[PDB]
Scaffold this motif. Structure first.
Motif: not given
Length: 118
Positions: A108-118
């Protein structure tokens, strides 16, 4: 930088992912991690585990504003899992669930960060 309110929302998302997660049986993975073992029933736990932590404590920290980064919560999740895997044994349900909690959290941490990166 994230405001305290924005950070709180993110940390709440991470915690919720952990506490709603179920095993195939439908059992909550988080059940035995919500509250630390009874001191009366598990004096051995407290002799063995240097810095006990539970999800109640982590939740309280989120509510009180005591975390200033996502990484800070991640370190507490690492500690939660490490302790469980020390007190219990490989192949035990608690040991497995501790690893499951770690996986759920980091995904979930990875998914949240991934969304922040676009």
């Amino acid at each position: 930088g994230s405001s305290p309110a924005y950070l709180k929302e993110i940390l709440e998302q991470l915690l919720e992912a952990i506490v709603v997660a179920t095993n195939p049986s439908g059992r909550l993975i988080s059940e035995l991690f919500q509250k630390l073992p009874s001191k009366v029933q598990y004096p051995d736990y407290y002799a063995i585990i240097k810095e006990p932590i539970d999800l109640k404590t982590i939740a309280q920290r989120i509510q009180n504003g005591s975390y200033k980064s996502i990484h800070a919560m991640a370190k507490d999740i690492d500690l939660l899992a490490k302790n469980a895997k020390t007190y219990n044994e490989p192949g035990s349900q608690v040991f497995k669930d501790a690893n499951s909690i770690k996986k759920i959290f980091y995904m979930k941490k990875a998914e949240i960060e991934h969304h922040e990166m676009a």
